[PDB]
Design a protein around this ligand. Structure first.
Ligand SMILES: CCCCCCCCCCCCCCCCCC(=O)OC[C@H](COP(=O)([O-])OCC(O)COP(=O)([O-])OC[C@@H](COC(=O)CCCCCCCCCCCCCCCCC)OC(=O)CCCCCCCCCCCCCCCCC)OC(=O)CCCCCCCCCCCCCCCCC
Ligand SMILES: CCCCCCCCCCCCCCCCC[C@@H](O)O[C@H](CO[C@H](O)CCCCCCCCCCCCCCC)COP(=O)(O)OCC[N+](C)(C)C
Ligand SMILES: CCCCCCCCCCCCCCCCC[C@@H](O)O[C@H](CO[C@H](O)CCCCCCCCCCCCCCC)COP(=O)(O)OCC[N+](C)(C)C
Ligand SMILES: CCCCCCCC/C=C\CCCCCCCC(=O)OC[C@H](COP(=O)(O)OCCN)OC(=O)CCCCCCC/C=C\CCCCCCCC
Ligand SMILES: CCCCCCCC/C=C\CCCCCCCC(=O)O[C@H](COC(=O)CCCCCCC/C=C/CCCCCCCC)COP(=O)(O)OCCN
Ligand SMILES: CCCCCCCCCCCC(=O)SCCNC(=O)CCNC(=O)[C@H](O)C(C)(C)COP(=O)(O)O
Lengths: 124, 128, 104, 70, 178, 84, 63, 175, 88, 219, 459
């Protein structure tokens, strides 16, 4: 999609360009601005040599999943729990990405509203 | 009425759509009869020489030798310098050479210039 | 040679030629192994228009789809350590500008 | 290497019970496997994590101020 | 295939060939047998309504519109018998067809196997040797002056004669030699 | 070893148009004044083991019954074993 | 018997020859056979040194 | 192995994990590699012992040839054919040795890429830098001589390069 | 393949079978040597239909030039035997 | 370039397939469409998924030609589907093997082709790609289902259309065993291989409900 | 080098003092032994050369050509044994004498430390070939062919002689070692341009260059089998060897002067490969294929880079072997059918299966199937050309495609399809022909195991 229809058929400035997102400061919304937390360090995440595109904030669950698979080689089905933990963390990451998209969209809406309100006031 | 089939060089007219077969005349019939006569005479000669038990070799074919001789050795004595022939020969035998010369000369002059400014990035270029 | 009668008893059944009959100047061009001129169910110009039209449309629509891509309502994927600076190219003696990832 | 089955000429061909039982067995095995996987693993087709609604997120957690604060 | 061709096709032959081609292509269009039978009876009826036309110009104006209509609706992928000139097994077994004269080049150790076959082959060769001398004279006396007009051959006339030019028709390799 | 059993053809009087789609083909043909002469040449395609047909979905569900029974027995046995 | 002789003339002898050639001639030269440096995970211990890799940062486990 | 120098062809200390079976089910890899050991490795080992004893019965040596240093093409008169011959042979030998050096560095780089696996992009910067330096030097020496190369052409190329360097340095000084 | 080596008897029986299943001919008057045009009073369209039936029942095509001069069941059988090289 | 080439290839070849009469030609066009899908997967930067699809397609397409060749041999070298009639009962093991192969090809949950094709479709939907390429991939999936049902309907369902002398025979242990090995493959290999290989990409854990179902819907 | 030259000379009195029915056996045995002896020249150095004496020297460019020259004579004798059966003892001895003299001149040409000695022997090879073509050829065109093969050559070679003596009047020597060590640049002058042309054109005409290739189809088609074998295998390589030797004095003028010849070769390879697609004669098709391969070798030599020279050496050896094999196959067909028309005798696989296998392997090597040395040379030249200019890849790939097309067209036309019915004199292949084919083809597939033997002095 519905977002594509509102960006291709509606107003391009109404919704983000996914290439350049975000276009606003991070701490613009609220002054807390908590940091993201990473569990896997440089060295162990290197030694497990996962993948460059698997080296994200979800790496520790992948480490555990990999270890579980390795120990139980004969019983492949046994490490069901490790997989769930990893996909749940990826689900949270994707939800956070969706939240960033919606956040920037709302900020763009409010900025357009502020500029049009200011233009109305100035012309009045 | 149905859409009409338009023949081309590589998609010819069907035999059943040919107006000439529907326009019959006694002269056409005698032409067909004598074409069949020529074909039958040739077939009879070939089969007489083919079924012969004494024959132990290739059956000589004048048509094949005529084809090969015309394709190879009859060309130059029948050649004349003609505007069509002269222009076609000049074009097809010179134009590609000068075209490729221009292309390669331009490419190599560009390469040489870029090497002169040093902006080619010839790193790891060891084997040439 | 392909459109010559295949039910006739030719002296050369594969080439579909007779012994003494004159040979076309371009026989080796038409040997059923190569270009044939047999009539087609559809006219040559119609096929050319259809083939060209289909290719052009697909080509045009691929360019249009490049202009208007498809994606999901998500922000960029985030990577922890300075966008994986040391794992992608390195140069650990430069200390690049820190990129901070926002919590939401 | 097989059995002797003579031509029939316009009737149904002769069938051995071996091929029938094997075909039925393998069809039943395929359907049983599909059912077993669907019972044990339904989320491989339906999904396990609900899709969030972006319009249901409040303006508070996304850092939206009512147009005058910042 | 076997029969010698004529100088031309008569109007009846053209109509019959169009009938066969149209029926085959309608079968290609009408896959099922009941549908094909219904439409083929209709097709036969549509042929039959002008069976009795006496005007040759009218009949030739017909068959022409008919072949144009056929070319319009001819099922560009008709069914072909596998062994037919367009089939998927047309010339599949030509590589297995070996001429009979090749057996003359066999080593004597090879001919030591199959002695009865080669004895019968020798008998056939002797028969060919005599029959050929008879055949040449018979063909020379029977052919009209100025050369043959049609590539049709006469049968044997006397008791001990064999049909002229028979060796390469009788000694075909096989339809499926291997 | 080959198929040398001296196969004998069935009786030609066996084939009838009755009870086949060739019957309704003949009926619709008679409605306009024509007849199908080759109908009995094709009756063998609707006569013996070819008389009964199966649907596309029925073809897809070839072994659903006994496989489903195996599924229910397996799931019941697993429920009984794990409840222990 | 046929299977026993087949598994000797077609499996055992080729693997013997190839193992000899790889272990005593190919491996003689450097870099001819290069492996992957197997993955190391937290909590693993190494045969050569005996030291134990430290565990991870005890992330919160909930759901 | 002692058959090659470890310093010329270095390797990391080869850390390997220890087996940590979390289940009691027997993994077929262990049993299968044990039966491989029994059925393959021992007979091959015994055959090698036989061959090695037979070799030890007959021991003889071969030597690496030593080549003296001779004056190079710079200490050669313009038409003195004998010194030019000596210098040309020496230069060709040096060119071959330089090619072998580049080969050694490339072998190092390939081994690093295969060994470091998924993290080769970071864990092979040393070999990449070494190969870049060696490649730059080799290119500066021998890049464009073409077929019919010689010590004289290499010397002319070096003289041109270092004339350009001297001009650039003088321009920088007088900037 | 496993196709039986068909004989002249089989070809004759199968040709007569197809012909008796043609209802424009009464089977009891049918015979191997009976002419199609005069002994049975069939049109040339019926003859080409019979050729098509023979083709569809033996699985191969008879060319028009050969087919248009096959007027008896016996010579149809002979043509099929010559094409398929049947011994007895 | 790779994505666009794969998309146009799979669309064009499925479009050609849905109307062919030679069974081998239909299966060859199916192979071409599957190759186009593979290079679409490559073009969306998912190489390991393309390799997995290669491995699964091997099994089920090889078995599909097994069944086609069995039918051709039983019907005296006949390859046209207009002359192939009721073979569902006339030859049942080929029938069941071909049904299983078609189900694996079109994408049936928890079969061998599922573990590749379903993930292919999900990855194409969840990527920054051409709109046209995505549309053509979905249409190619639908046309894959179309030519599969074309083969089944015209070869196995109706009344017989082959010559009267029936020489149909499947009772040879070579054919049965060779087909059944690939049949067990086409049933279980996807599950086994997918659960045995280490994970080589981040999955798509969350999707819109309709967009997770898109492959099954179009099929 | 005399340990190879003297036995080749002794081949003559041995041939002329032989029994009337022992000439072929003795010639074949002793030529094979001479080949075996010459095989020890392959032990080359990484340094300068094998300088035997003031007159002869060996090089890793010369050694493969010498070994191929020595190996070609027994095959030529085996090929000539058949069609010379009905001819008198004195004339057969004369034919073998011509072959021996050709080998002797080629051997002395390839070592030839002197450029004038090289020219003298390089032109002395002309006489035996001309006599062989115009004496033991079959058709009436052979005389005309000989004239072409003569005058073209001399039209190129007479200026070279002048240039050569001119050089010695200025340099003081024409010894190749002194020339290489005392080489000096050529200034861009009209006199130097014409010296360059006089040095190049003689070797260009015998490659042959695309515009100057008219003599080759005639000479190769009208020559007997031994003549065609020696023309395609060794005599075409004299131009390449001479260019590789002489381009050392032509720098840096080669950079400018190479352009017209580079364009001629790059376009003429396409032209001649296309000509092969429409050819009614087997020998003419093989001759045009030779022209295409030598055009590629000309490009390689003109680029004058190490990879170019290695590829050119490998391609020269591989082409010699492959073209000799192809001519032998064509002649085996011709001696049965007596027509030399490709379309006449068809479907020979069903009658001659082993000869069909030989045809297939010869077409595969002509097609440059890896890892054959044909493809090794092809790829080295192509990579060198790509470094020279990235646009050469279009022409090179088009040439590869057309080469595969005409090679498989030649194979399919002659071996596949249906046999011609009226031809009933196709006898089973003799042991002599099969042995000849194997002796052509095993050296190729065995040289692919040790490529450095044929990669030249820049390896
Ligand atoms: C692949 C591994 C092989 C291992 C086994 C060892 C084989 C040794 C063969 C040596 C060369 C053969 C001699 C040539 C003349 C043939 C003699 C003959 O007439 O046969 C009579 C004999 C009896 O048959 P018959 O019934 O009496 O005759 C009936 C008719 O003749 C009808 O006969 P036909 O229909 O059966 O045809 C005869 C057959 C034989 O005829 C040929 O065509 C053979 C020549 C093909 C090559 C064409 C030139 C292209 C350049 C390739 C160079 C490779 C050489 C490597 C070094 C070789 C050392 C000498 O032709 C073919 O079957 C076509 C095969 C096409 C192969 C194309 C692939 C080439 C590249 C393969 C990989 C090579 C590098 C690998 C690198 C990585 C791995 C280490 O038949 C045979 O024995 C067949 C020969 C073996 C088949 C060769 C196919 C592969 C071998 C390639 C060369 C060696 C590979 C080394 C790697 C080992 C690891
Ligand atoms: C019929 C079906 C097949 C049956 C037969 C089965 C057996 C097949 C095995 C043979 C082919 C398989 C290829 C495997 C090759 C094994 C041998 C090879 O490795 O040895 C080569 C050795 O062979 C030579 O390199 C190639 C032979 C040279 C060819 C010379 C041609 C003979 C003269 C003829 C006249 C010349 C005419 C052409 C003129 C140019 C390369 O060894 P290399 O690693 O390198 O060093 C040799 C050993 N060192 C280390 C001690 C130095
Ligand atoms: C036919 C089949 C093939 C046979 C072989 C063909 C190969 C022969 C091609 C000859 C190679 C090149 C010849 C001359 C090259 C010189 C460069 C020239 O082309 O460029 C311009 C040359 O300008 C003009 O060309 C001047 C000459 C004009 C007269 C030439 C006739 C033009 C067509 C003749 C072609 C016929 C060839 C066959 C003759 C029988 C640059 O002018 P400029 O920079 O100032 O002077 C450069 C030379 N300097 C430095 C030594 C002074
Ligand atoms: C580039 C190609 C340039 C033109 C090449 C011409 C070659 C001429 C000689 C070929 C020999 C004769 C021949 O091949 O005959 C035609 C032969 C037989 O015809 P059938 O249809 O099979 O008939 C069967 C029933 N009778 O068919 C062919 O092989 C012709 C093939 C010609 C191909 C030309 C079209 C190729 C265009 C490709 C463009 C797209 C490139 C791919 C893009 C890649 C992007 C990642
Ligand atoms: C396949 C048929 C080809 C026929 C031969 C093609 C090659 C032609 C090459 C030129 C032939 C003669 C060149 C002279 C030989 C080299 C000698 C030399 O380089 O000395 C030059 C001499 O240069 C000349 O005299 C050259 C004059 C050439 C006259 C003949 C012209 C022949 C045709 C010319 C046009 C075509 C040129 C290229 C044709 C290529 C082949 C197609 C300079 O010496 P000096 O003059 O003493 O010192 C300078 C101070 N005085
Ligand atoms: C589905 C694919 C496309 C189909 C479209 C084709 C449309 C065709 C319909 C056209 C109608 C016609 O008949 S076209 C009319 C052609 N002219 C005549 O029919 C005049 C005299 N008729 C004959 O001579 C016949 O042969 C006959 C006497 C019947 C038998 O003869 P025999 O006694 O010697 O068997």
């Amino acid at each position: 999609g519905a977002h594509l229809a509102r960006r291709y058929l509606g107003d391009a400035s109404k919704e983000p360009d996914p290439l350049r997102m975000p276009t606003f400061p991070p701490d613009y919304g609220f002054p807390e601005r908590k940091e993201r937390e990473m569990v896997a360090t440089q060295q162990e995440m290197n030694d497990a040599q996962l993948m460059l595109q698997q080296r994200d904030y979800c790496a520790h669950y992948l480490i555990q999943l990999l270890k579980c698979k390795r120990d139980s080689f004969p019983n492949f089905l046994a490490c069901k729990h490790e997989q769930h933990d990893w996909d749940y963390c990826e689900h949270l990451d994707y939800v956070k990405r969706m939240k960033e998209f919606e956040r920037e969209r709302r900020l763009l809406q409010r900025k357009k509203r502020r500029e049009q309100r200011e233009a109305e006031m100035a012309r009045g | 009425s149905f859409p009409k089939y338009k023949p081309s060089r590589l998609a010819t007219l069907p035999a059943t759509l040919d107006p000439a077969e529907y326009d019959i005349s006694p002269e056409t019939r005698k032409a067909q009869a004598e074409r069949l006569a020529i074909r039958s005479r040739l077939k009879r000669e070939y089969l007489l020489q083919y079924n012969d038990p004494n024959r132990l070799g290739v059956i000589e074919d004048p048509a094949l030798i005529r084809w090969t001789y015309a394709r190879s050795a009859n060309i130059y004595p029948n050649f004349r310098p003609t505007p069509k022939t002269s222009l076609l020969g000049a074009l097809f035998g010179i134009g590609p050479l000068f075209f490729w010369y221009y292309v390669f000369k331009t490419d190599r002059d560009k390469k040489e210039k870029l090497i002169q400014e040093g902006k080619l990035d010839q790193t790891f270029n060891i084997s040439y | 040679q392909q459109e010559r009668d295949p039910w006739y008893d030719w002296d050369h059944p594969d080439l579909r030629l007779n012994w003494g009959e004159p040979i076309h100047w371009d026989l080796d061009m038409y040997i059923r192994n190569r270009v044939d001129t047999s009539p087609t169910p559809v006219s040559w110009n119609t096929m050319c228009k259809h083939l060209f039209g289909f290719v052009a449309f697909m080509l045009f629509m691929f360019w249009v789809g490049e202009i208007y891509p498809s994606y999901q309502p998500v922000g960029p994927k985030q990577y922890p350590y300075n966008d994986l600076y040391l794992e992608r190219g390195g140069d650990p003696t430069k200390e690049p500008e820190p990129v901070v990832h926002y919590e939401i | 290497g097989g059995v002797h089955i003579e031509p029939r000429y316009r009737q149904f061909p002769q069938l051995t019970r071996s091929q029938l039982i094997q075909a039925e067995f393998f069809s039943a095995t395929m359907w049983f496997w599909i059912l077993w996987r669907f019972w044990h693993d339904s989320d491989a087709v339906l999904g396990h994590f609900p899709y969030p609604d972006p319009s249901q997120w409040t303006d508070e957690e996304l850092g939206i101020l009512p147009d005058d604060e910042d | 295939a076997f029969s010698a061709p004529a100088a031309y096709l008569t109007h009846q032959q053209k109509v019959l060939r169009l009938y066969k081609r149209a029926l085959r292509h309608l079968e290609s269009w009408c896959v099922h047998r009941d549908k094909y039978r219904y439409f083929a009876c209709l097709m036969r009826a549509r042929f039959d309504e002008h069976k009795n036309e006496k005007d040759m110009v009218k009949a030739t104006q017909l068959l022409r519109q008919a072949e144009e209509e056929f070319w319009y609706g001819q099922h560009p992928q008709p069914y072909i018998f596998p062994e037919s000139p367009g089939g998927t097994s047309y010339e599949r077994y030509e590589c297995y067809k070996v001429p009979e004269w090749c057996l003359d080049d066999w080593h004597p150790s090879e001919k030591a196997m199959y002695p009865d076959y080669f004895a019968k082959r020798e008998q056939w060769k002797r028969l060919r040797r005599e029959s050929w001398e008879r055949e040449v004279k018979q063909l020379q006396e029977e052919t009209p002056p100025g050369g043959p007009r049609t590539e049709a051959l006469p049968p044997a006339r006397k008791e001990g004669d064999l049909p002229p030019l028979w060796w390469h028709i009788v000694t075909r390799p096989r339809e499926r030699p291997m | 070893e080959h198929g040398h059993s001296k196969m004998e053809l069935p009786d030609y009087k066996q084939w009838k148009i009755e009870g086949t789609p060739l019957e309704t083909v003949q009926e619709k043909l008679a409605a306009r004044g024509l007849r199908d002469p080759w109908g009995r040449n094709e009756a063998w395609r609707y006569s013996g083991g070819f008389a009964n047909n199966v649907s596309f979905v029925g073809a897809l569900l070839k072994g659903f019954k006994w496989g489903f029974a195996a599924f229910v027995v397996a799931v019941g046995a697993e429920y009984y074993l794990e409840s222990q | 018997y046929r299977h026993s002789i087949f598994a000797v003339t077609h499996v055992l002898i080729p693997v013997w020859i190839i193992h000899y050639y790889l272990k005593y001639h190919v491996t003689a030269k450097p870099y001819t056979v290069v492996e992957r440096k197997p993955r190391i995970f937290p909590g693993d211990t190494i045969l050569e040194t005996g030291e134990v890799i430290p565990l991870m940062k005890e992330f919160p486990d909930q759901h | 192995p002692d058959s090659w120098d470890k310093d010329v062809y270095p390797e990391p200390p080869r850390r390997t994990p220890a087996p940590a079976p979390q289940t009691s089910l027997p993994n077929p890899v262990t049993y299968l590699t044990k039966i491989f050991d029994l059925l393959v490795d021992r007979p091959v080992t015994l055959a090698r012992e036989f061959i090695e004893q037979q070799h030890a019965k007959n021991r003889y040596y071969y030597y690496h040839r030593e080549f003296r240093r001779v004056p190079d093409i710079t200490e050669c008169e313009e038409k003195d054919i004998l010194c030019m011959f000596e210098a040309e042979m020496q230069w060709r030998r040096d060119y071959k040795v330089d090619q072998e050096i580049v080969n050694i560095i490339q072998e190092r780089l390939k081994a690093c890429q295969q060994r470091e696996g998924e993290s080769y992009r970071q864990n092979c910067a040393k070999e990449l830098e070494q190969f870049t330096q060696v490649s730059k030097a080799f290119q500066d020496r021998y890049s464009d001589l073409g077929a019919h190369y010689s010590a004289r052409k290499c010397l002319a190329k070096q003289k041109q390069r270092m004339l350009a360097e001297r001009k650039a340095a003088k321009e920088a000084a007088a900037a | 393949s496993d196709a039986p080596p068909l004989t002249l008897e089989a070809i004759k029986d199968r040709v007569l079978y197809v012909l008796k299943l043609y209802d424009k001919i009464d089977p009891e008057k049918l015979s191997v040597n009976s002419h199609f045009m005069k002994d049975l009073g069939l049109d040339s369209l019926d003859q080409v239909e019979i050729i098509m039936a023979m083709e569809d029942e033996f699985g191969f095509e008879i060319p028009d030039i050969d087919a248009e001069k096959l007027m008896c069941p016996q010579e149809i059988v002979d043509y099929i035997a010559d094409k398929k090289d049947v011994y007895e | 370039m790779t994505l666009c080439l794969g998309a146009i290839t799979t669309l064009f070849t499925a479009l050609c397939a849905i109307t062919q009469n030679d069974i081998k030609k239909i299966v060859a066009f199916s192979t071409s469409s599957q190759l186009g899908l593979m290079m679409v997967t490559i073009g969306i930067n998912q190489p390991h998924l393309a390799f997995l699809h290669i491995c699964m397609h091997a099994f089920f397409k090889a078995m599909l030609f097994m069944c086609s060749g069995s039918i051709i041999h039983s019907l005296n070298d006949e390859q046209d589907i207009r002359k192939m009639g009721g073979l569902y009962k006339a030859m049942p093991f080929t029938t069941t093997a071909l049904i299983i192969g078609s189900l694996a090809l079109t994408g049936m949950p928890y079969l061998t082709g599922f573990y590749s094709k379903d993930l292919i479709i999900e990855a194409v939907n969840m990527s920054y790609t051409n709109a046209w390429a995505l549309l053509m991939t979905l249409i190619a999936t639908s046309l894959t289902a179309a030519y599969s049902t074309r083969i089944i309907f015209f070869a196995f369902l109706g009344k017989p259309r082959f010559p009267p002398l029936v020489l149909i025979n499947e009772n040879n242990p070579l054919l049965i065993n060779s087909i059944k090995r690939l049949l067990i493959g086409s049933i279980f290999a996807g599950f086994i291989i997918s659960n045995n290989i280490p994970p080589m990409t981040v999955p798509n854990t969350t999707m819109p409900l309709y967009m997770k179902m898109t492959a099954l819907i179009v099929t | 080098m005399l340990k190879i030259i003297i036995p080749t000379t002794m081949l003559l009195p041995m041939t002329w003092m032989s029994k009337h029915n022992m000439i072929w056996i003795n010639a074949t045995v002793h030529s094979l032994l001479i080949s075996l002896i010459s095989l020890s020249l392959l032990n080359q150095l990484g340094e300068n050369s094998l300088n035997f004496s003031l007159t002869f020297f060996s090089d890793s460019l010369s050694a493969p050509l010498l070994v191929l020259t020595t190996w070609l004579l027994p095959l030529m004798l085996m090929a000539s044994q058949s069609h010379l059966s009905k001819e008198t003892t004195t004339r057969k001895k004369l034919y073998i004498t011509m072959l021996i003299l050709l080998q002797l001149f080629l051997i002395m040409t390839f070592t030839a430390t002197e450029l004038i000695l090289f020219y003298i022997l390089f032109e002395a090879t002309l006489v035996p070939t001309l006599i062989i073509i115009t004496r033991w050829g079959n058709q009436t065109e052979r005389l005309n062919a000989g004239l072409y093969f003569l005058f073209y050559t001399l039209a190129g070679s007479l200026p070279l002689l002048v240039a050569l003596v001119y050089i010695q009047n200025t340099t003081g020597s024409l010894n190749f070692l002194i020339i290489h060590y005392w080489s000096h640049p050529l200034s861009n002058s009209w006199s130097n341009i014409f010296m360059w042309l006089a040095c190049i054109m003689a070797f260009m005409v015998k490659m042959p260059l695309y515009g100057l290739h008219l003599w080759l189809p005639k000479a190769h088609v009208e020559a007997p089998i031994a003549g065609s074998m020696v023309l395609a295998a060794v005599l075409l390589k004299l131009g390449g060897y001479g260019m590789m030797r002489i381009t050392t004095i032509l720098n840096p003028l080669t950079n400018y002067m190479a352009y017209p010849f580079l364009m001629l070769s790059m376009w003429g390879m396409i032209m001649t490969s296309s000509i092969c697609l429409r050819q009614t004669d087997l020998k003419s098709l093989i001759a045009y294929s030779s022209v295409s391969h030598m055009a590629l070798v000309i490009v390689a030599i003109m680029i004058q880079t190490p990879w170019s020279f290695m590829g050119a050496t490998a391609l020269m050896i591989a082409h010699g072997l492959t073209s000799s094999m192809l001519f032998c196959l064509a002649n085996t067909n011709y001696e049965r059918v007596h027509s030399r028309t490709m379309i006449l005798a068809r479907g020979l696989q069903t009658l001659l299966p082993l000869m069909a296998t030989w045809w297939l392997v010869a077409s595969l090597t002509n097609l440059a199937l890896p890892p054959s040395i044909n493809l090794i040379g092809e790829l080295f030249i192509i990579t060198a050309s790509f470094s020279w200019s990235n646009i050469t890849i279009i022409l090179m790939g088009m040439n590869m495609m057309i080469t595969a097309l005409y090679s498989l067209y030649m194979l399919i036309t002659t071996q596949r399809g249906k046999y011609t019915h009226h031809i009933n004199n196709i006898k089973p292949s003799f042991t002599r022909e099969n042995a000849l084919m194997a002796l052509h083809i095993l050296p190729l597939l065995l040289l692919t195991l040790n490529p450095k033997m044929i990669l030249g002095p820049l390896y």
